[PDB]
Design a protein around this ligand. Sequence first.
Ligand SMILES: Nc1ncnc2c1ncn2[C@@H]1O[C@H](COP(=O)(O)OP(=O)(O)O)[C@@H](O)[C@H]1O
Ligand SMILES: Nc1ncnc2c1ncn2[C@@H]1O[C@H](COP(=O)(O)OP(=O)(O)O)[C@@H](O)[C@H]1O
Lengths: 701, 346
Amino acid sequence: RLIVDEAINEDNSVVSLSQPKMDELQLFRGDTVLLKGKKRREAVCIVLSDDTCSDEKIRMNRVVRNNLRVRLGDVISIQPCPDVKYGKRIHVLPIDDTVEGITGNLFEVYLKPYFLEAYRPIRKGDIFLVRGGMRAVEFKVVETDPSPYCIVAPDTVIHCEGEPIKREDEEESLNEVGYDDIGGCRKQLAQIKEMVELPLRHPALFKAIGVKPPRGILLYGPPGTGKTLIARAVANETGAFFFLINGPEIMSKLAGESESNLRKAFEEAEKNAPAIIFIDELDAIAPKREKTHGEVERRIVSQLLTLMDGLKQRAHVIVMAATNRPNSIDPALRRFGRFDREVDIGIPDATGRLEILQIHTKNMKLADDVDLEQVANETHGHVGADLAALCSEAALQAIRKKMDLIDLEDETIDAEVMNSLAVTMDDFRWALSQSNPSAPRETVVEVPQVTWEDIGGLEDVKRELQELVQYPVEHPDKFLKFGMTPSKGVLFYGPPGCGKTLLAKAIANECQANFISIKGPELLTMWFGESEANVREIFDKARQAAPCVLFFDELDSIDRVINQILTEMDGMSTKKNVFIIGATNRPDIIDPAILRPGRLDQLIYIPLPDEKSRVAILKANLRKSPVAKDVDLEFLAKMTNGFSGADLTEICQRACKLAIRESIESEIIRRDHFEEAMRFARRSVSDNDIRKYEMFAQTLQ
Amino acid sequence: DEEESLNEVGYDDIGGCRKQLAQIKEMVELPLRHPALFKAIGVKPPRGILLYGPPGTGKTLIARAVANETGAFFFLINGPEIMSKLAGESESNLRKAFEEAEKNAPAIIFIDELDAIAPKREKTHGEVERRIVSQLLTLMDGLKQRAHVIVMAATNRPNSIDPALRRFGRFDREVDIGIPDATGRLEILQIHTKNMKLADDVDLEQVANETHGHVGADLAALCSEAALQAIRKKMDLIDLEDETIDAEVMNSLAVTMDDFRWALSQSNPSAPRETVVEVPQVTWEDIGGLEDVKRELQELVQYPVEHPDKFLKFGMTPSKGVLFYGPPGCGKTLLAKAIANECQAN
Ligand SMILES: Nc1ncnc2c1ncn2[C@@H]1O[C@H](COP(=O)(O)OP(=O)(O)O)[C@@H](O)[C@H]1O
Ligand SMILES: Nc1ncnc2c1ncn2[C@@H]1O[C@H](COP(=O)(O)OP(=O)(O)O)[C@@H](O)[C@H]1O
């Protein structure tokens, strides 16, 4: 009686649970349980343990729900290992269309790396796959004769007789995309699953409910974000039929039968309830422009938005919506009932780029020379499709220097050569050496990681900042119980380049919320273009990125864009626990009419860092570039009167560059470079404006 | 009836793209020259390529050369004769122009002048250009990961190319044919003039120099009306026009330098004046002085591009923007030539 969730570990034969489930039916750490399935299907799976598992919510990969032909959330009774014996005389016959003209019987190439000596058990006639060698192949069990569950021994017969047999079609392959395949976006994909599975997993419960149906969700944002595979993956989860209704073949046909194309595209599967439809790139099919100087696109999108209402409170049609940018979509299309609610997939982050690079490389059989961490760092501002392209032609470069230089080209493939082949680090460098930044440089949402000064500011800036940015997220009602709302916004002002931008990143890292980094000039360049709809769009996608904080700087550089900021900030989503923080250096050229309470009005001064704070930011700086063992951190700050964080980064950048400069200059360490770092000529410090900053400080007093 | 064979062409007939020719060969030879190897490839294929740039750069010859190199079937789907039809059968023309070579795997298709057929503008009134770009977008995706057909796309300037046509997956990584330089112009005139038998008094190298910023089609026109200036002085003055065409007396005639100057009297600026990308020919010893700035720039252009493991020894991004401020005209632009030429940078 355990309920299926999704686990982190890729491997089969893994039960990951919390300890009451293993003490409740005398299970141990090293053991095997039987998996009860529908139509008396059985699967074998070895117990492990973990900590991040909801204890009643058992969590695995796709292989056990492909074995039992079950879905996410079913009930499974548990039978331990001593039902069956050791077993021998095994032989594997795989699927024919998994391979494609492949060399040999492949069990000597694949089944011997399958033996990780953990003795993974095998049910008779079950389904399991081993990845590796540039392409995944599933291994059906056909010609084994043990006792009908077989724990695999190294003494058992690696037998290479059988041909790969024809696929039997009650089961759908794991080459079709799954949830763990789309794992790089370990984020709000989980909650959109959590708000779409209910008519899917509970069809009759939604048949007998009077809930006005959630009948459509938008996945806008950057292209190449797997949205087609998002729909395919949720269809492969819940078993609903998927039909991809793409825009250009709809608009390609002549007038009249394009409507009939929409008719078959709607009710080819309304009788196949539940089912999923998908009308991706809605900018190409549904804009609201006079650029579309015609009427066939209007006749397409009209009655599309009203015969998506073919669910007459007894059907189970559901639509995923995908497009580039939501502002170009028609708003009467976006009107409620016709279309209700919105979410963004957005761009992946570098931390998510780590596991998208991990889970894309399950087949290519990487070597041990690479580390995969430094690969994901420089590719900030790239879509995961571009990373898939990157590792794709990395594999193509790796198979390009081999297999024809050796002149192994023939009509038959050589599986052993490409299985012995592996991708390596300079292959990834060569992949980086092509035109990968075609995914452009837009705004980015990211989970922060800087934590050197995550608890607030310097002195009582800490004690106001930490309460302002994480005491609402556990104590909302305590503020109303003692009288009034939390604050709306706080002001950052003082000397520039002191790490205040990184300080807001550490603030967002402390409260475990997202970070918004909008800067001055990219809003200033579209101030001429008059695209403030994009500005409130990025504000709203920050607002639906709850929890988060919105950090903006150089607000004095704009006064119209600031005026639409003051218009949009009236609907303050404090119950969403998002926050607005504003930064500047010159506080007087901006108007004083934005300083009233209930708005951006709290005016704590951000000081220039002290000598002990200079030692602290030096300690933050030396984590990226290591320091000499002979370092006196007060000696580096003994001549600093107003040296900001930018000045110290300017010192360390040029000192490390001079060290790396003279490290190569010998014919073919850094204490002397620290010595010339504090013993150089210039000490260009803007100390004239700290008097003006204190004039403003005691103007506020 | 049969004309001169388009298949029997030299593979070195293009010479003006020998900075990009190597990697376009290196990106196309795997599905083409290795088809039985490529049907076993589980990596997602190269499915798109885009060649923009200046017009008239032999992209037809590029597609013909790579097709005749790999021996695949070649078809050229040209835009005007497929947009000349009425709606409906022009769509069927596009469908049959996609599917005649699906049975001829592996193959190449050439759908040049995409600017004429797939624009990005609000001026696109009507439905016919929408119905042409649509199902082109989806019938390229009709490859079922077993066919080996592949798009070859030629255009001019990819801003006017539609961004949904420029969709990732719909198009892959893209390259530029660029413009040939004068050093490249030397071998393209060397390979073009194998038929005219130029006189030896010229040196054919300084001829390549003053035609900087020109296309090789204009080079072909330059040698063409140079040859006509060479042969205009005979074949009717002395009247060598016999009952046949006296090919021997005109093949005996040679083109020479004043014919090249008279061909230079025509519209050489009909080439589009475009910004040139090229590894320079002015080197480091051509500029002397300001030695502190010299080794500062020298390390700045050598060690970020050739020793990045030293920069990542600490772990540190190298600097990116250096500044030149001082008196104008001293050679700040001139030292850029040397500092790009020494470290083999474009
Ligand atoms: N979060 C993610 N996890 C895994 N793969 C991803 C992710 N985001 C994007 N991809 C990859 O990007 C590609 C998107 O292909 P494409 O059809 O062009 O875009 P979309 O499916 O978004 O319309 C897919 O092949 C998918 O593997
Ligand atoms: N860089 C170059 N090197 C050699 N020949 C060139 C070059 N650029 C242009 N040409 C010549 O110009 C002609 C271009 O003709 P064509 O391919 O029909 O037009 P387009 O290049 O617009 O497709 C070719 O015959 C080719 O010989």
